Amino acid sequence: MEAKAVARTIRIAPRKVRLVLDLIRGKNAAEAIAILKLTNKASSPVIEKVLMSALANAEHNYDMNTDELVVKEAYANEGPTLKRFRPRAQGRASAINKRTSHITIVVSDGK
Amino acid sequence: MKLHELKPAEGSRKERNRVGRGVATGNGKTSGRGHKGQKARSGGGVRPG
Amino acid sequence: NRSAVSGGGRKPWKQKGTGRARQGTIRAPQWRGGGIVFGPTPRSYAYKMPKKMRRLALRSALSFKAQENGLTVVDAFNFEAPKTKEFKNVLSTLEQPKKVLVVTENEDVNVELSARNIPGVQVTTAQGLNVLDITNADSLVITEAAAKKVEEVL
Amino acid sequence: MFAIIETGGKQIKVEEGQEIFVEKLDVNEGDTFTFDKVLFVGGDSVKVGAPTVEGATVTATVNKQGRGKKITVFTYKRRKNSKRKKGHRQPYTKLTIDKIN
Amino acid sequence: PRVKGGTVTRARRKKTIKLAKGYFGSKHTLYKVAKQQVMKSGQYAFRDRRQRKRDFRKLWITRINAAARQHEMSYSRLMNGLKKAGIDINRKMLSEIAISDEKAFAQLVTKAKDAL
Amino acid sequence: MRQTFMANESNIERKWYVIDAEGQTLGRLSSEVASILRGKNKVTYTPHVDTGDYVIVINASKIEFTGNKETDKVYYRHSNHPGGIKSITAGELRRTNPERLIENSIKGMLPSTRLGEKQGKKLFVYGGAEHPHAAQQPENYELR
Amino acid sequence: AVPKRRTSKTRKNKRRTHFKISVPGMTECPNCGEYKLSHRVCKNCGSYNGEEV
RNA sequence: GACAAUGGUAGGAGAGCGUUCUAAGGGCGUUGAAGCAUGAUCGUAAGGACAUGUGGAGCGCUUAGAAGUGAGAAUGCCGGUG
RNA sequence: UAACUUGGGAGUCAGAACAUGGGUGAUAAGGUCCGUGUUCGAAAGGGAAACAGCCCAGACCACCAGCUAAGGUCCCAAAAU
RNA sequence: ACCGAUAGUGAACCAGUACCGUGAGGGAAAGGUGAAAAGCACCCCGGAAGGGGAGUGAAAUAGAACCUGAAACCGUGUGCUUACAAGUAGUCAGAGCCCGUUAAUGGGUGAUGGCGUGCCUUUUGUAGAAUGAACCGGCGAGUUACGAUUUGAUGCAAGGUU
Ligand SMILES: [Mg+2]
Ligand SMILES: [Mg+2]
Ligand SMILES: [Mg+2]
Ligand SMILES: [Mg+2]
Ligand SMILES: [Mg+2]
Ligand SMILES: [Mg+2]
Ligand SMILES: [Mg+2]
Ligand SMILES: [Mg+2]
Ligand SMILES: [Mg+2]
Ligand SMILES: [Mg+2]
Ligand SMILES: [Mg+2]
Ligand SMILES: [Mg+2]
Ligand SMILES: [Mg+2]
Ligand SMILES: [Mg+2]
Ligand SMILES: [Mg+2]
Ligand SMILES: [Mg+2]
Ligand SMILES: [Mg+2]
Ligand SMILES: [Mg+2]
Ligand SMILES: [Mg+2]
Ligand SMILES: [Mg+2]
Ligand SMILES: [Mg+2]
Ligand SMILES: [Mg+2]
Ligand SMILES: [Mg+2]
Ligand SMILES: [Mg+2]
Ligand SMILES: [Mg+2]
Ligand SMILES: [Mg+2]
Ligand SMILES: [Mg+2]
Ligand SMILES: [Mg+2]
Ligand SMILES: [Mg+2]
């Protein structure tokens, strides 16, 4: 049985989010929580909340046992980009992309 | 005759040529005007005589 | 066209030095919202043919009806008042097809009113005959007086 | 035992009970075709034709008259705005050898 | 009446992209690159259908030469010998016999040698 | 109809041969060995596979040259460093490294392809009359 | 100064082979059993070397 | 049946494909239109089907008529994204 | 087996090499300007390692058939150690 | 036999607005839930955002710039393949492996061999180290009117035609 949580339009670039997701993918939930807590990156706390929400929906909605759960799927899809500009020298403006991520976590009992 | 079976007299109608509609037609690109010179320009050419 | 589209008087940027394509107006055809090159312009599509050919065309359409047995001659149409149902009944007794062209010598209001709402049925005068109406109809129901009038005219 | 037979401007090495694909022959499906020209007969008894073994024939049954997979023939000359695209499907006759000689 | 670009443009380009399936990177993705590659693929295929005939003829001769040398004869003499004998087995069939049936090939060699 | 046999690793059989280099011209021995290594002497020769046989050359020190090649035939190698051209004569190469002289001669007659490099690796050359590949049970081959 | 050619997806991804973050050097805390960074005070229980910090 | 021709730029000539709209006829569609996606399909080419998924209300076909009728390139224009 | 006439529609008016008859230049130029022929242009295929213009030869499509041209036949690399 | 949201007015929308300029003046972008709002009670994670259920609905993979939802582009997983090799990336030949179709002398991949210097423009001649294009999408160039001439078609004809 699989339980899923998604955090949509998180204001962090997918590339940055994906580095942390690479750490936790395919690991037991308990270990994944530990990695997220002890990893010093901006995406880690947001990812942790997605994982915690996924584990909660496993226990509540599907009555799965939390201890046996594994992080089957972890991935970040691109959200819509916030388009901004930075004034440069000589009256020129250079564009700034403030990118967003859709973070999905799937947890599985392996059954 | 019938409005669903109309036919013009044979030889009465020919389809117009359309230039600048691809290489295969033989009138693509330069559109029969050749390369450069006054004659290949829009509104180009000399007065008669 | 480029002249008709609003604005676009000034040159967008200098001819040289910017690294951009040279442009003379923002309403040029390859611009979004620019003028159209050689689009439709208001004109008539009507043309003429010699009178003898017009007459030949009418006679050819009428003859095709006669050859296909699409010609029915009736003595007269008598309608004191306009009644669609009565006219519909008449057509059924006459065993007429769905598409019928009814011809009268002169305009008859009651006949025209009676057949106006019936799909496939068209009512015309003898002078009003035109090849399109004749060709479209499967059959023609003509009054004796109308038929004689048509013969004289053509 | 094998036989060398000549058909469709080519030579084919055949054995009994073998399916062959040859240039289209003028025969209907289910008909029996005899290959008249046998260049060589193999096996324990070897016969060499000069150029054909005399009185040697191969009998085959026509299985299918078909067209090969479409070949798209495309050629172009760069910078000349010249190209040609043609489709081709080569006709073929499929047969099965019944008997040699 | 106005005719908008519509669906014809997508349909045509998609056919080209499908023809360039299996090509590397952008060549299997973008219309302009794939079109060029599909054009190159046509020209190459046309050339290679002709080349294939030259290549297989070359292989058959190479194999016959080896087979002849085992019978202490050059390819050049073997083929000249076969011609004088009147044997019209082609190089493909000769090559196949040499591989499949050595005894049969040996008999052909003797015929060629006798003709010379 | 397509009927051409194609050799593959399953059906290919590679033999071991010993060729004596004593009293043989380098190039004439070299050209013959190159054909054996490439499977040109097999009826099952197939271009895209290695149908060739392993070749052992012995007595490479006793290989011969004609004319004044011993002094006048020079091998040049560059180190890819500026002015990095180094030369040794064919005669000196024969004295110092006869195996290299034979090996380079044959490899220069092999195709510069992945297959060609592989076919060159099947050549084993020895300056003396003794080789260490007795287990391979090599067969003596006489050059034509 | 400037790239002569655009970088392909393949080339870019080959370059990103070593662009990754390692797992934190973490071990289970003896007192509470929660993972802690090695040589650091346990954040959960505030204990280091079997003593409260 | 026989045999003759069939490289090609500028360029001339011919025959066609497909797009939108109109007329007439004849059809399809909530028991699923168009569009979109996928496929190992068909035609000498432009191109045409069919099946399935998606979609959710329009749309083919035949003959004729009429065109804002076909894009890869214009340091093209606008948008999106590298 | 073309030719000519009349009428509708063109494009072209920067040419190149090679060979050969000449002018110019210096019996210089991948020079330049005229005569002649060929090829390229607008021509793929084979040869000349590569190589518009040289040599052989003019590709309707298909074939894992055959004979030849120029050029070749010890190995690369098909064919004479 | 006019447009159908890059079209059609600059403007289908709070547009001569926003924005730009001292000013004259220049001047955009931006339509679509559903039949009905029935617009997600309640529960759970979270500060919120967002999500998982439950429920509404024919449909929520119709949940608010909410019909459809192409491509570039970014990810995740997976069958085959790859760390001695010199690549206009294909093409032709071809084992092994993995599959099984509009059932077709099938599909995916590809050890290894042969051959092979993009396209367009402009040129005597361009792999060109000449030009042009980041990519994808849309948009973007012989038209119409009135005369002339010629050809085809058709009616009538020493007449033809308004
Ligand atoms: Mg400033
Ligand atoms: Mg035409
Ligand atoms: Mg042309
Ligand atoms: Mg073009
Ligand atoms: Mg031009
Ligand atoms: Mg010029
Ligand atoms: Mg001109
Ligand atoms: Mg620039
Ligand atoms: Mg406009
Ligand atoms: Mg329209
Ligand atoms: Mg378009
Ligand atoms: Mg040939
Ligand atoms: Mg020809
Ligand atoms: Mg032609
Ligand atoms: Mg023309
Ligand atoms: Mg257009
Ligand atoms: Mg574009
Ligand atoms: Mg001359
Ligand atoms: Mg050889
Ligand atoms: Mg419209
Ligand atoms: Mg739209
Ligand atoms: Mg608008
Ligand atoms: Mg506007
Ligand atoms: Mg390896
Ligand atoms: Mg290859
Ligand atoms: Mg030119
Ligand atoms: Mg370069
Ligand atoms: Mg220029
Ligand atoms: Mg550029």
Ligand SMILES: [Zn+2]
């Ligand atoms: Zn602790």
